[PDB]
Amino acid sequence: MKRTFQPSELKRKRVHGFRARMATKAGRQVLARRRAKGRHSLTV
Amino acid sequence: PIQKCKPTSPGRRFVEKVVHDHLHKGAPYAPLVEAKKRTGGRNNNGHITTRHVGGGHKQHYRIVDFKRNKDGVPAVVERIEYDPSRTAHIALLKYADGERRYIIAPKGLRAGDKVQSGNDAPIRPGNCLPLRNMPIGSTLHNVELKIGKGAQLARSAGASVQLLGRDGSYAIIRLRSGEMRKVHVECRAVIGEVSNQENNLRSLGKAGAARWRGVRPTVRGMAMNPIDHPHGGGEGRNKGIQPVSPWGQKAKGYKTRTNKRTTKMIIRDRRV
RNA sequence: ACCAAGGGUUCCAGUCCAACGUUAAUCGGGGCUGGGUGAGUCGACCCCUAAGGCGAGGCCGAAAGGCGUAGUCGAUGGGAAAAUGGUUAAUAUUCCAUUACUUCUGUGUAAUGCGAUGAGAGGACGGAGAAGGCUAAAUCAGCCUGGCGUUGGUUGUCCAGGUGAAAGGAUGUAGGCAUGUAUCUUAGGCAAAUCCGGGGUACUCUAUGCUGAGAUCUGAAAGUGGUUGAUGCCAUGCUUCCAGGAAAAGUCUCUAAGCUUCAGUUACACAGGAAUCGUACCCGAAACCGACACAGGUGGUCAGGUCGAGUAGACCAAGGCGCUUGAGAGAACUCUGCUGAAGGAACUAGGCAAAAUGGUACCGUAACUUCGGGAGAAGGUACGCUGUUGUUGGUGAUUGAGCUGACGACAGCCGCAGAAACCAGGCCGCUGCAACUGUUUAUUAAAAACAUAGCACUCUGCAAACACGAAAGUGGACGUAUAGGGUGUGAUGCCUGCCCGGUGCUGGAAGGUUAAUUGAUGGGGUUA
RNA sequence: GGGUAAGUUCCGACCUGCACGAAUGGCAUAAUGAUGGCGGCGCUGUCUCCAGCAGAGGCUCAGUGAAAUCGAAAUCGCUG
RNA sequence: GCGGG
RNA sequence: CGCAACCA
Ligand SMILES: [Mg+2]
Ligand SMILES: [Mg+2]
Ligand SMILES: [Mg+2]
Ligand SMILES: [Mg+2]
Ligand SMILES: [Mg+2]
Ligand SMILES: [Mg+2]
Ligand SMILES: [Mg+2]
Ligand SMILES: [Mg+2]
Ligand SMILES: [Mg+2]
Ligand SMILES: [Mg+2]
Ligand SMILES: [Mg+2]
Ligand SMILES: [Mg+2]
Ligand SMILES: [Mg+2]
Ligand SMILES: [Mg+2]
Ligand SMILES: [Mg+2]
Ligand SMILES: [Mg+2]
Ligand SMILES: [Mg+2]
Ligand SMILES: [Mg+2]
Ligand SMILES: [Mg+2]
Ligand SMILES: [Mg+2]
Ligand SMILES: [Mg+2]
Ligand SMILES: [Mg+2]
Ligand SMILES: [Mg+2]
Ligand SMILES: [Mg+2]
Ligand SMILES: [Mg+2]
Ligand SMILES: [Mg+2]
Ligand SMILES: [Mg+2]
Ligand SMILES: [Mg+2]
Ligand SMILES: [Mg+2]
Ligand SMILES: [Mg+2]
Ligand SMILES: [Mg+2]
Ligand SMILES: [Mg+2]
Ligand SMILES: [Mg+2]
Ligand SMILES: [Mg+2]
Ligand SMILES: [Mg+2]
Ligand SMILES: [Mg+2]
Ligand SMILES: [Mg+2]
Ligand SMILES: [Mg+2]
């Protein structure tokens, strides 16, 4: 059985990384939320 | 003419191809070719805006001279080539000053013929003249609408218009539709008929031959569910509705032209 | 056996056995303590661009924001160069040995026109099909070394092992492509050009050039010949067909501006440089995705022997393993197999499942047909080993020796059986549906459902109809009525009757009715 | 009417079409189909009717060691 | 509430 | 008999 994850590290960074989240307004809100909660890792 | 294949397979029994002998066998003229990518029928937003488009053979684009703005200088036809983007054949012209161009090939044209442009050109198939200087009754193609824009009407494989006559400052012509239109006498046209003219006797014979040309299959609206098409639904076959498009517009006889800017150029309608 | 992705120390050594390991463990991919990844040539970075993204100005939008020009990113594609042996417990095209190659700087020596953000060439590219010439590889013979066999024989027409060194450098062959050359000229190439393109002549076609495998030479105890022979090289070639088959830089030609005896350019010698990052280990896997040391999934590369058409199949090579609970017993019953008297579908909803057929050559084959088919229709005969006698194909030492491929007859011998095991079509008659190849309910439905080539109706004259968007704009289409969109039917043959009253659609326009707007009149309220 | 010893299925006709019918096409049609129905030849453990044998379990010994369920139990038959 | 016949 | 008109 082929499963859903199928990792690729370039695609991980290009969809979810720091610069992706910083390039939009809703991503900057994700980052503000995660800094207010105190997460030890901001992004993937 | 038209060749029929032997029925050695079920897929070859109904293949009828148009074969011409005078066509060039070789590569196109490289300074006049560019790259054309496929679209899948999708726009800016990435949405499908034309259904049944996708796939096909990789195709270049031959840059064709529709304006014909080298007046006085005569040319000689070098060869006639197959063009993948249109239904007509094209011709490679070599002007007397050395330049090379492509044009839509007229019907009788072969390698070695002379063509010219301008309001001084002899009345010969392949010559581009203003409608002001063309005898009444002529058969024409590659006709301009706006002055300097290039040919827009009667460009496909075997088309032609008929110059019915000039009055005031407008020529009156009859299109392949049957419509009677008027055009400004300062617009250009080419003498003759378009080349291929036997295109429509071709039979593909098999479903993959349509996919070679970038056409994807059509699903009948009758064959869907009510959430996809106004024809969807039902136990068994049924079409208890007046035919409409996927977006609700009537499909049998309802007219859709809504352009009040141009109704004065239309002289007679095609259904009158 | 080896790469990419993914993982992240699992790699190697010493030491320990609680937990972890479906049992014990002295062992381990477990715990603890140390060690281990060496590059101008491999890769990444770097130069170049595809789809796509972002986008100074700009256009659009209550705000938030959307799109897009110049640009700038983005490989999965284009762009310099290294081979053969040895060495570590663990790295090696990286270290060492020998022999190379590429590209930059300096300092010099001789010559003299160099020069783009411009123009041109090139890079530059499809599917299929073969024929030839090679090489890798395999195999036999010769040659060197060793042997003389627990049991008949084995000093030979015996046995075993070994024995064919690369990149690079010099030469230039088979094959492939284009007719080439001086002079005069020139409505073109964003302006110029000595260059590309177009014309005028004269001389040429066993002439000019270009490219390009291999072999030979060199590197360099035995170390030589044959046969077979690529999926590799010539080959980004040749033939053929229609569905007509990326871009940009590196590179080459030419001048513009710009200095102008300087700079730049190019020929050589000497002297130096080529940074940074990755490199261990796992790959049909116990280290990746599946909660597990999970019978699943996971792109690409290599891949020997006998027989064989074969990368199928049986048995082996190199290499790697016996799959982390065992020991006994040999009950019913369950699973997976093998054989079975006489009968042969009587079983069952149903021949479900099993049994059966099976290769090569030759003989032979019905209705029907769209003339291709049906058809491997159906059915039949031969096939092993030994000997003798015939034709032929390839290669070719000294015309043709040696090795090798295909086909015949005769004669004999053995068995129940010669296609020997593995491998390897069951077939025929009547009939409904759908013409056919194809698609579909990931995980109870593969079909008569969907699609299809062909047929018809209708819309659409181009700033097209149509669709997406709030708009800007985008697709249709760099298309133009033999084109494009919607709708029904569904190859082909013969065909497709009657009804316009209902609802739609198309046309018509004299009358009736009817909105905003306009406000003629009439009535009232207030008081001089 | 045919096929079987015997045929609610099959094939061929009849027409009394509850309630066929001509591009939501009508009637056929070579070839094709892991498509629906029916009949044959071969072959058989499908069956009459099961027997023997081989491997893996079952069972016994040693080691490790689950599951759903569960108000509590001192948890028999028959007739009411 | 407008025109009918 | 057609067109247009009520929100107890
Ligand atoms: Mg369509
Ligand atoms: Mg449905
Ligand atoms: Mg449904
Ligand atoms: Mg609806
Ligand atoms: Mg029904
Ligand atoms: Mg280890
Ligand atoms: Mg243990
Ligand atoms: Mg360890
Ligand atoms: Mg770097
Ligand atoms: Mg943008
Ligand atoms: Mg801006
Ligand atoms: Mg870039
Ligand atoms: Mg790459
Ligand atoms: Mg190692
Ligand atoms: Mg090819
Ligand atoms: Mg002896
Ligand atoms: Mg090399
Ligand atoms: Mg390694
Ligand atoms: Mg295991
Ligand atoms: Mg596994
Ligand atoms: Mg029996
Ligand atoms: Mg018997
Ligand atoms: Mg029975
Ligand atoms: Mg019975
Ligand atoms: Mg069966
Ligand atoms: Mg069987
Ligand atoms: Mg079908
Ligand atoms: Mg599927
Ligand atoms: Mg399913
Ligand atoms: Mg299924
Ligand atoms: Mg249908
Ligand atoms: Mg039909
Ligand atoms: Mg009809
Ligand atoms: Mg029966
Ligand atoms: Mg019907
Ligand atoms: Mg009908
Ligand atoms: Mg099929
Ligand atoms: Mg026990």
Residue numbers in the entry:
A (entry chain Z): 1 to 44
B (entry chain A): 2 to 273
Text lifted from the article:
In this study we present cryoelectron microscopy (cryo-EM) structures of the ribosome from A. baumannii in complex with the clinically relevant antibiotics amikacin and tigecycline, solved to high resolutions of 2.8 and 2.6 Å, respectively, allowing comparison with previous apo structures of the A. baumannii ribosome (Morgan et al., 2020). The overall structure comprises a large 50S subunit, composed of 23S rRNA, 5S rRNA, and 28 ribosomal proteins, and a small 30S subunit composed of 16S rRNA and 20 ribosomal proteins. These constituent parts form the recognizable structural elements of the ribosome, including the central protuberance, L1 stalk, and L12 stalk of the 50S subunit, and the head, body, platform, shoulder, and spur of the 30S subunit. Therefore, for each structure, the 50S subunit, the body of the 30S subunit, and the head of the 30S subunit were treated as three independent rigid bodies and their reconstructions refined to nominal resolutions of 2.7, 2.9, and 3.0 Å for the amikacin-ribosome complex and 2.5, 2.7, and 3.0 Å for the tigecycline-ribosome complex, respectively.
